[PDB]
């Protein structure tokens, strides 16, 4: 779909409010970003070595 | 202070009979001691109600 | 050449009916003209109590 | 040949793969105790009217009594009475006597609850879904001549099986009919049954039970549950005088003796699983109206 | 997520004619007998015997038709739903029920460890979808038939889209928490704050 | 609309509704934990008792059936007939033939412990092979089928429930109606 | 005779099958309406 | 009780008049009608139902 077009956009919802509650509770700043794929991540052999 | 057999099996082990010809239930416990032929009837279990 | 055959009174399989006069069997028929092939058996009338 | 050739010629010991049991297999080798119920199978694709008549006579007698108290509805109340069983809105007669009006009210209340009970009885008849049975079993008249019935149908088995030996010992003429009715592929025979290239099929029981339990649409029809069939089982064949036979039979009855065999039956088997006509009763309607016009032709001659 | 009525019409068009013939045998008379039969067949002296016979047969015919229309509409509804994972049309599937899951999801690994799910695994490896909205749009346009996913996401999708309907089974009752590193100082107070949200209605506020 | 609702709730009252008089198999939890009413039983000293004794989680049934172990099966039939019993674990075709005898005797839906009846034998003996050969020769022909026809296979609108009381009430109300007409005679 | 606008009473009464209409149009229309009432 | 005391101390005061001891005793109290509702762990009540 999009091989190279990366922008900052507005993310919100349930777990975003959870992260805002945790940053409101615990003393830390935070960086929010997406993942480079559309996948969780599974244990798989890479096709070299 | 011993587990021993009764009934048709207990009288067969005593030699009072020669061959049990009866609807004899086939299981593990009887096959340890006596021999079985190939069965004539095949059925399971059920519950009788009114 | 003669085998002792023990049995128990099974309600669909083993029918124990008293003799007619003395050690004889009333040779009754079935619905297909087959006489009921009875046999002489020996046993008690009741249990031990 | 096959597994019997492997065991009898001592190239193996036993066959965990399934096998039927007949006399010559008991001659060449020795089987174990049976562990699963597997025979063979064939797959294909009163006084209410009397007491109401008595009550009709009671209503006619009370109408005669109304005529005696307080001039054409003496015995002519039958048409009013069995016209008002059904609430037809037919102009019959308006009785001046209060006794006849109360009696017709009781009769009509009984008729309303009668037709309500009849609707409930038809719903109870709707509960019982009928299942027609073309072949009753192995003693069918269809197993005498397929052209005795008007379509000459067709059925067979798998090649080189012991079911063919059972046929050749039981029905050599039906083996000669099956000579034109042979097949090769089991799923090919399934496609022949679905598309219509085959009518019936004889095989073992539980294999067809498992193939029908996952058959989509559930259009395949069995015959009973193994009633008029060979009534056999599956076992493991061992050599004549094998040292393992006693321990194997004890282990098989142990696996029966704890539901572990039943657990594997539950695991490996899934035995799951109509229009607007009542033409039996409609043919009864035609027969009763023919009887009614016969009675009218009887009453014409007077 | 009838023809039998035409037979009844032919029969009553015989019945009215033979009733007027029986009236002509032993006596606007023709139209009077016709309109009397019009009153009879719809429920609006020898001929009156066949009249009461046909009235009884007319009521038993319309009662049987009420019975079998109720039969055709009551019992013919609930055979449409899917019986979940234990469906033999999914345990032993075909090219008809199209069911799938998200490509590289842990649900696929959960099905892969269970060695009695290899048939569904080889079914669903043909339709591994990237995102959930792919599966939503594909089942929305009848290009799918089922989808395997967690509960509350599909509950929210059923709340948004009324045509999307989940099933009745609720298996593998698992939990979602917060993915973490290895041994790290950000471990204890995070779970403490989550459980502090659990003890009050802040989880219910998020609901 | 009231008499149509009466038709509707009588259809709700006698057509679809059915109380669980049966057990629907061994996996009924009401017999897993019994009481004074739900009485299950077996024949005294049978292999069903040993098979349930090997069951490590059904020890409740093994310790409960000792109150109700019976000598003969006819004792069990007469006990469940006289409402002393409420369940009875037994082999299937025996109770099927008894259902052919007595119509009230009804089996259950589930079918478990699929076992077999054969012929009891001694140890190593010269009468071991030929008995099994004769039994298998009986299985290959229709001799087993003929023995099934003699014993196994051979077995043996209404509106009388809530309208027979209506029949009695209508037949009784005629006399009271004629009595009220005698009251009208006393007036007239 | 007086069933000009008074046919509402007997019309809704024949919905439930509880004056004889002399008109042929009346008989056909009441028959269609009563057949619809039966299926209703 | 601790969750109620962190949520509703007033309803804890109402429950001070509404206490009980036996779990199956409160079950029998629900059977007879001596109690309108009962707050308890969910799966145990599912097994009891
Ligand atoms: C966050 O985690 C730290 C772990 O360092 C914890 O700090 C403890 O705070 C309590 C009082 O709130 C003290 O009794 C402990 O001695 C502290 N431990 C240490 C050494 O830090 C606590 O769980 C959280 N609070 C913060 C911000 O320190
Ligand atoms: C079992 O029966 C068989 C016959 O089926 C018996 O074997 C026969 O013995 C006689 C002795 O003269 C021979 O002439 C026959 O040829 C034998 N038949 C066979 C099958 O070879 C046998 O004696 C019986 N006993 C057992 C258990 O083997
Ligand atoms: C969407 O992705 C395409 C392909 O990389 C990109 O060209 C486009 O600019 C993106 N849309 C936005 C958010 O501008
Ligand atoms: C976080 O910690 C810093 C000191 O390390 C402090 O200045 C700041 O106010 C804290 N923020 C809060 C209030 O959590
Ligand atoms: C698998 O092999 C292909 C080349 O055939 C390669 O392009 C790809 O990156 C490999 N996948 C992984 C897991 O790295
Ligand atoms: C059996 O025979 C004995 C004779 O000793 C008798 O006392 C008993 O009553 C008999 N039982 C019956 C009637 O079966």
mmCIF file of N, CA, C and O in Angstrom, chain B residues 12-44:
data_model
loop_
_atom_site.group_PDB
_atom_site.id
_atom_site.type_symbol
_atom_site.label_atom_id
_atom_site.label_comp_id
_atom_site.label_asym_id
_atom_site.label_seq_id
_atom_site.Cartn_x
_atom_site.Cartn_y
_atom_site.Cartn_z
ATOM 1 N N UNK B 12 -17.012 -72.421 38.357
ATOM 2 C CA UNK B 12 -16.235 -72.918 37.229
ATOM 3 C C UNK B 12 -14.779 -73.132 37.616
ATOM 4 O O UNK B 12 -14.146 -74.093 37.163
ATOM 5 N N UNK B 13 -14.235 -72.243 38.454
ATOM 6 C CA UNK B 13 -12.869 -72.408 38.938
ATOM 7 C C UNK B 13 -12.738 -73.621 39.848
ATOM 8 O O UNK B 13 -11.661 -74.224 39.929
ATOM 9 N N UNK B 14 -13.817 -73.998 40.533
ATOM 10 C CA UNK B 14 -13.830 -75.209 41.340
ATOM 11 C C UNK B 14 -14.041 -76.470 40.515
ATOM 12 O O UNK B 14 -13.989 -77.569 41.074
ATOM 13 N N UNK B 15 -14.283 -76.342 39.213
ATOM 14 C CA UNK B 15 -14.504 -77.499 38.374
ATOM 15 C C UNK B 15 -15.901 -78.067 38.425
ATOM 16 O O UNK B 15 -16.125 -79.162 37.896
ATOM 17 N N UNK B 16 -16.852 -77.363 39.042
ATOM 18 C CA UNK B 16 -18.227 -77.843 39.067
ATOM 19 C C UNK B 16 -18.922 -77.684 37.723
ATOM 20 O O UNK B 16 -19.983 -78.282 37.515
ATOM 21 N N UNK B 17 -18.361 -76.889 36.815
ATOM 22 C CA UNK B 17 -18.895 -76.727 35.474
ATOM 23 C C UNK B 17 -17.774 -76.918 34.462
ATOM 24 O O UNK B 17 -16.593 -76.996 34.814
ATOM 25 N N UNK B 18 -18.155 -76.989 33.189
ATOM 26 C CA UNK B 18 -17.206 -77.205 32.107
ATOM 27 C C UNK B 18 -17.104 -76.038 31.142
ATOM 28 O O UNK B 18 -16.015 -75.776 30.625
ATOM 29 N N UNK B 19 -18.202 -75.330 30.894
ATOM 30 C CA UNK B 19 -18.221 -74.264 29.897
ATOM 31 C C UNK B 19 -19.377 -73.334 30.214
ATOM 32 O O UNK B 19 -20.535 -73.763 30.195
ATOM 33 N N UNK B 20 -19.074 -72.071 30.508
ATOM 34 C CA UNK B 20 -20.131 -71.102 30.774
ATOM 35 C C UNK B 20 -20.776 -70.721 29.448
ATOM 36 O O UNK B 20 -20.138 -70.107 28.587
ATOM 37 N N UNK B 21 -22.035 -71.095 29.275
ATOM 38 C CA UNK B 21 -22.840 -70.664 28.142
ATOM 39 C C UNK B 21 -23.907 -69.742 28.716
ATOM 40 O O UNK B 21 -24.921 -70.199 29.257
ATOM 41 N N UNK B 22 -23.669 -68.443 28.606
ATOM 42 C CA UNK B 22 -24.445 -67.428 29.301
ATOM 43 C C UNK B 22 -24.129 -66.079 28.661
ATOM 44 O O UNK B 22 -23.101 -65.942 27.993
ATOM 45 N N UNK B 23 -24.998 -65.071 28.844
ATOM 46 C CA UNK B 23 -24.618 -63.708 28.447
ATOM 47 C C UNK B 23 -23.530 -63.136 29.343
ATOM 48 O O UNK B 23 -23.799 -62.326 30.236
ATOM 49 N N UNK B 24 -22.293 -63.560 29.107
ATOM 50 C CA UNK B 24 -21.181 -63.271 29.997
ATOM 51 C C UNK B 24 -20.521 -61.957 29.607
ATOM 52 O O UNK B 24 -20.082 -61.792 28.464
ATOM 53 N N UNK B 25 -20.427 -61.042 30.568
ATOM 54 C CA UNK B 25 -19.838 -59.733 30.325
ATOM 55 C C UNK B 25 -18.332 -59.862 30.143
ATOM 56 O O UNK B 25 -17.644 -60.454 30.978
ATOM 57 N N UNK B 26 -17.826 -59.317 29.044
ATOM 58 C CA UNK B 26 -16.406 -59.378 28.719
ATOM 59 C C UNK B 26 -15.728 -58.116 29.235
ATOM 60 O O UNK B 26 -16.147 -57.000 28.911
ATOM 61 N N UNK B 27 -14.683 -58.292 30.041
ATOM 62 C CA UNK B 27 -13.923 -57.166 30.567
ATOM 63 C C UNK B 27 -12.488 -57.604 30.835
ATOM 64 O O UNK B 27 -12.094 -58.736 30.542
ATOM 65 N N UNK B 28 -11.712 -56.689 31.422
ATOM 66 C CA UNK B 28 -10.302 -56.952 31.686
ATOM 67 C C UNK B 28 -10.127 -57.963 32.811
ATOM 68 O O UNK B 28 -9.241 -58.824 32.744
ATOM 69 N N UNK B 29 -10.967 -57.878 33.846
ATOM 70 C CA UNK B 29 -10.740 -58.650 35.064
ATOM 71 C C UNK B 29 -10.996 -60.133 34.844
ATOM 72 O O UNK B 29 -10.281 -60.981 35.391
ATOM 73 N N UNK B 30 -12.000 -60.466 34.037
ATOM 74 C CA UNK B 30 -12.276 -61.866 33.756
ATOM 75 C C UNK B 30 -11.268 -62.457 32.783
ATOM 76 O O UNK B 30 -10.935 -63.641 32.889
ATOM 77 N N UNK B 31 -10.757 -61.650 31.853
ATOM 78 C CA UNK B 31 -9.827 -62.162 30.854
ATOM 79 C C UNK B 31 -8.450 -62.455 31.430
ATOM 80 O O UNK B 31 -7.664 -63.162 30.790
ATOM 81 N N UNK B 32 -8.139 -61.924 32.616
ATOM 82 C CA UNK B 32 -6.872 -62.235 33.268
ATOM 83 C C UNK B 32 -6.806 -63.689 33.710
ATOM 84 O O UNK B 32 -5.712 -64.256 33.808
ATOM 85 N N UNK B 33 -7.951 -64.303 33.979
ATOM 86 C CA UNK B 33 -8.006 -65.619 34.598
ATOM 87 C C UNK B 33 -8.595 -66.689 33.697
ATOM 88 O O UNK B 33 -8.082 -67.807 33.665
ATOM 89 N N UNK B 34 -9.659 -66.382 32.959
ATOM 90 C CA UNK B 34 -10.265 -67.361 32.064
ATOM 91 C C UNK B 34 -10.097 -66.888 30.628
ATOM 92 O O UNK B 34 -9.571 -65.798 30.382
ATOM 93 N N UNK B 35 -10.535 -67.704 29.674
ATOM 94 C CA UNK B 35 -10.444 -67.375 28.260
ATOM 95 C C UNK B 35 -11.826 -67.081 27.696
ATOM 96 O O UNK B 35 -12.841 -67.568 28.201
ATOM 97 N N UNK B 36 -11.847 -66.280 26.635
ATOM 98 C CA UNK B 36 -13.066 -65.898 25.943
ATOM 99 C C UNK B 36 -13.001 -66.337 24.490
ATOM 100 O O UNK B 36 -11.938 -66.325 23.865
ATOM 101 N N UNK B 37 -14.153 -66.719 23.957
ATOM 102 C CA UNK B 37 -14.285 -66.973 22.533
ATOM 103 C C UNK B 37 -14.564 -65.649 21.826
ATOM 104 O O UNK B 37 -14.522 -64.575 22.431
ATOM 105 N N UNK B 38 -14.849 -65.708 20.548
ATOM 106 C CA UNK B 38 -15.261 -64.472 19.904
ATOM 107 C C UNK B 38 -16.739 -64.210 20.188
ATOM 108 O O UNK B 38 -17.542 -65.145 20.188
ATOM 109 N N UNK B 39 -17.111 -62.959 20.458
ATOM 110 C CA UNK B 39 -18.441 -62.681 21.010
ATOM 111 C C UNK B 39 -19.554 -62.856 19.993
ATOM 112 O O UNK B 39 -19.353 -62.725 18.784
ATOM 113 N N UNK B 40 -20.744 -63.162 20.508
ATOM 114 C CA UNK B 40 -21.930 -63.249 19.667
ATOM 115 C C UNK B 40 -22.764 -61.980 19.702
ATOM 116 O O UNK B 40 -23.424 -61.655 18.709
ATOM 117 N N UNK B 41 -22.757 -61.257 20.817
ATOM 118 C CA UNK B 41 -23.589 -60.074 20.968
ATOM 119 C C UNK B 41 -22.707 -58.862 21.232
ATOM 120 O O UNK B 41 -21.675 -58.968 21.894
ATOM 121 N N UNK B 42 -23.107 -57.710 20.702
ATOM 122 C CA UNK B 42 -22.410 -56.458 20.959
ATOM 123 C C UNK B 42 -23.422 -55.410 21.390
ATOM 124 O O UNK B 42 -24.331 -55.075 20.625
ATOM 125 N N UNK B 43 -23.262 -54.894 22.607
ATOM 126 C CA UNK B 43 -24.146 -53.852 23.111
ATOM 127 C C UNK B 43 -23.439 -53.048 24.189
ATOM 128 O O UNK B 43 -22.443 -53.485 24.771
ATOM 129 N N UNK B 44 -23.977 -51.867 24.450
ATOM 130 C CA UNK B 44 -23.455 -50.939 25.434
ATOM 131 C C UNK B 44 -24.300 -50.900 26.688
ATOM 132 O O UNK B 44 -24.935 -51.891 27.065
#
